[PDB]
Amino acid sequence: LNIGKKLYEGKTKEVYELLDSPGKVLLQSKDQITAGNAARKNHLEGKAAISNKITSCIFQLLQEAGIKTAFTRKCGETAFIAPQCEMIPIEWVCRRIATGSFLKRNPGVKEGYKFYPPKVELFFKDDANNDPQWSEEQLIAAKFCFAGLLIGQTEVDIMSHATQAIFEILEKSWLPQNCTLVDMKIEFGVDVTTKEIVLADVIDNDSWRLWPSGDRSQQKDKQSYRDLKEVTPEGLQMVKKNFEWVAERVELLLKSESQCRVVVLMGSTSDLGHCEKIKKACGNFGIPCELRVTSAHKGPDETLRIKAEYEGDGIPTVFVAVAGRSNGLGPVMSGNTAYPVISCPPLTPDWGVQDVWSSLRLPSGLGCSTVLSPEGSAQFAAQIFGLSNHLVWSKLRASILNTWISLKQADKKIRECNL
Amino acid sequence: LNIGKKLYEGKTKEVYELLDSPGKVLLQSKDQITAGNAARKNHLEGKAAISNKITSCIFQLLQEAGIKTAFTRKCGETAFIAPQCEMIPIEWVCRRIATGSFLKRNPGVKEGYKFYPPKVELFFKDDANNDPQWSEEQLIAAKFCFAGLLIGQTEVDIMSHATQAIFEILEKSWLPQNCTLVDMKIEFGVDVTTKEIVLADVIDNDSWRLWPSGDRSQQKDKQSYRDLKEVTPEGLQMVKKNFEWVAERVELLLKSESQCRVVVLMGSTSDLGHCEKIKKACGNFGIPCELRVTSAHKGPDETLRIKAEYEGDGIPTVFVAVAGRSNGLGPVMSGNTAYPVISCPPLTPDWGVQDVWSSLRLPSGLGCSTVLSPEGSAQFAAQIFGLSNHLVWSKLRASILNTWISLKQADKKIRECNL
Amino acid sequence: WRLWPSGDRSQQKDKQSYRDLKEVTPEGLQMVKKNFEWVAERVELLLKSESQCRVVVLMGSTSDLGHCEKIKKACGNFGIPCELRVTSAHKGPDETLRIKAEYEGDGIPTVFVAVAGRSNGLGPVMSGNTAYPVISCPPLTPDWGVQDVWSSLRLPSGLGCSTVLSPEGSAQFAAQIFGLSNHLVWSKLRASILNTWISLKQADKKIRECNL
């Protein structure tokens, strides 16, 4: 590992150039904890390893969901490799629950006020003035430029939407551990190579407020250190145990709590191309997808036996029925399983207007749903599993963001061809 | 409570007439455990309370799912009130896993062979000949008559289907406790008042095989007592602890592990009638259902804020979009949530052929599904929640049985109008 | 097997007659032999068609010949003779009735299949003037097929004319009709249900390998 010059150093991290890696840097954590802009600073042994472990797990989680993130890989106990960014000097905060500075700036609001949707705020980075709140209008008027990207209305709107999405993903991911994510702070930078705005810096135990069972008095985050009247050695051991508590649970956010499976049943091997599109699209949400050939019309006995194989092994299953012309496979399956059935018929413009009604108009006592897009039927199957699986949910959530970002970028492009 | 005369007494239960309660009886459990046809009999203190508690919990579970069952209520620690039945003298067994007598009657099959779907078998009740297996053809040819109901092809086909459905419901219900329901035995009788075939006798720790983590050596059922080489006082305490283990956990089968909610969003209060039908049908599955008024066309800002309230409180939610004419509410919602959205448009024959396409043909990146039936949209919502909620699943499964039974009954009726 | 003439076990012609003998005598073996000879004589009649079958495909235009060739080919698969005839109900209704009469009049059980594009009058006219079954199998394309099909489907009262869109399907339906009387046609239909089912099982087995 070919380490170059120390680029900068701050309160908790040293950033080094990597001579064998163009556009990449090494972020080495220090055994330092800090708070405020006064003398609250301490050595804390093992903090560097805890910060590194949390950020490395959280960045891998957000990256596997599809959030664009400045993270390459973990590099031992106390560092990580990242794409080099020109950091935007704004703290982006997201709140589910009103506490901390929100109450000070909004006297009359009580602790516990819930934000639907989560509240996003901006703070300009400046220790001299204790990080003052900025409006979107102030950030636009600053006309900041980083690695050649002017930070305008489009870029601010993107960081704002991304902050909400990142919060919701981390919020949903902590829920299975019976922890309430109250709020968080993140920072973005411009990747010096790609010129993309990406989540950067770290997300660690100083970034958020984490309340087991929603109970503030059980707070496990750095607020436990900020709240101390006086820092004693007995006080720092409590803080360290809180950081250890989070370090011991954070890797479980990468694990699937519940199993998911899509079974695509096709009446004919001529509709294989259409079923390959469903299977591929399921792969994008990390949901295993099996293809099976069975006809309701010509082998209804075999359809029910295949159904029984998937009903009988304890794995939650969504069936997707692909039947051309008069669809009996969706209906028959729908009538004989408690699991959901989606008809995704391979309609063409020739007879599709006529064929679709055999999926849509069903006798009473049948729940069978219809989705015409094959990518759509995978997404709907994912949305169903997202109710139980935070990993699938997070891919859906990040995909809503990324698609929205794509529209903003295409509008920005075509707007330049308006002069 | 006015107790009458003792009607019957067997190895483990006494049946008493209730003088104020026509067509109901009291089944009093005894502190007796037995095995085989031979001298394996023991007094075991608290067995009566454990048997009564298990059957009372299991019968309430099956009854609340919609399985027709001879159970009224628990009546203290050691008895229960039931509708009086003329018992059909057949033991109905269902197997997920090959063990016990299946291996003896099918040499070459290995322990652990899985049945898809679960295997149903009939045994005629006769201690003299160790309960010989009967075919369906033998039971039909017996021309049994109980409380005036001749047991024919229809009645046998009903008991056989009911046995599979009861087993699958109990199998699904034990899964969240990490217990494998291997197999079970049940008996049916004819309710002397209604003349309906109903599950009767008991389902207790003698009725099934229960393997924690699928591990036969951790068996918690009465097989632990059958297997003992010789019955010692130390041997009976181990059996008692197995029965106590089941007694403790059986009550958790009545508890919902996961929360469910349907939110029905309507573009106009003129579509209220249609939304009332969705809400009523959701009530049948025990799923709370909220009605909300919002227009994507006229109040899209408000649609997103309402969406956020239900996204934000940690409760798994299915949205049902009810918009007449050009449905924008399904699409908009679908594009802005990771939760499932179902369009259930209030189509009439006037313009329904034209309006439906606004739900069906969507831009890429939308998983929005379509269900035309309002009862159907609730059932689909139930099927989605049934992947996580064994109580919802069980109502869907019992509904498949009951619907099938009522077709058999209607066919039997119209067949009389053909002679 | 066990073979009972008139469903009468006491007339059993199979080897059960030999299994049942208390003791095997020379007189006992001659009775068994006669039972075997009875079956030997009659087994050859199982290969013979008891009833005659014919499909007549009437086409309004020789441009629909391709579509009629598919009906005739598919009829050949069931061992049913199939004749093609050209007649228009619109332009030669007198001739349509005379052609109908040739096939009504020679004692051979016949199913008529009417192939008329656009406004199908040939199915209806034929249906109204014969006691034999008529099937409309119109040569629909996606251009105007949604509009044309209704001329086969919505008929005045007193017409039994049926519709089958598939040309192979119209032959199979014709076969099913003859299968009520002809055990050879029936047996091809029955074996075809098996073979189709077997090939689904085989295709499912193949695609299951592409899932591990």
Ligand SMILES: Nc1ncnc2c1ncn2[C@@H]1O[C@H](COP(=O)(O)OP(=O)(O)NP(=O)(O)O)[C@@H](O)[C@H]1O
């Ligand atoms: N991917 C990245 N590429 C380049 N610089 C980065 C990246 N991630 C973080 N940094 C910078 O690394 C510097 C050192 O971090 P740290 O020691 O935590 O600083 P600090 O004292 O918190 N300073 P500041 O964040 O500016 O208030 C920070 O100033 C970040 O802007």
Ligand SMILES: Nc1ncnc2c1ncn2[C@@H]1O[C@H](COP(=O)(O)OP(=O)(O)NP(=O)(O)O)[C@@H](O)[C@H]1O
């Ligand atoms: N709902 C009911 N109504 C009437 N009788 C019932 C009902 N449920 C169970 N019984 C009968 O109650 C009797 C006493 O049960 P039990 O003490 O378990 O007898 P047993 O020794 O197991 N006899 P058996 O089931 O006939 O082999 C049995 O004969 C059952 O058929």
Ligand SMILES: Nc1c(C(=O)N[C@@H](CC(=O)O)C(=O)O)ncn1[C@@H]1O[C@H](COP(=O)(O)O)[C@@H](O)[C@H]1O
């Ligand atoms: N961690 C930080 C910081 C911040 O600068 N923190 C450090 C400075 C440093 O990390 O070196 C400190 O002084 O404690 N600013 C916001 N937040 C987080 O943002 C949400 C809202 O915080 P509020 O605005 O209510 O104080 C909560 O989760 C904080 O943890």
Ligand SMILES: Nc1c(C(=O)N[C@@H](CC(=O)O)C(=O)O)ncn1[C@@H]1O[C@H](COP(=O)(O)O)[C@@H](O)[C@H]1O
């Ligand atoms: N409990 C019984 C009985 C039965 O008669 N039980 C009692 C009779 C009595 O109450 O004295 C006993 O002797 O243990 N028959 C079937 N089963 C259950 O049904 C499935 C079939 O078991 P198999 O046929 O493999 O033994 C397994 O779950 C048994 O527990």
Ligand SMILES: [Mg+2]
């Ligand atoms: Mg700050």
Ligand SMILES: [Mg+2]
């Ligand atoms: Mg920092």
Ligand SMILES: [Mg+2]
């Ligand atoms: Mg038994």
Ligand SMILES: [Mg+2]
């Ligand atoms: Mg009993």
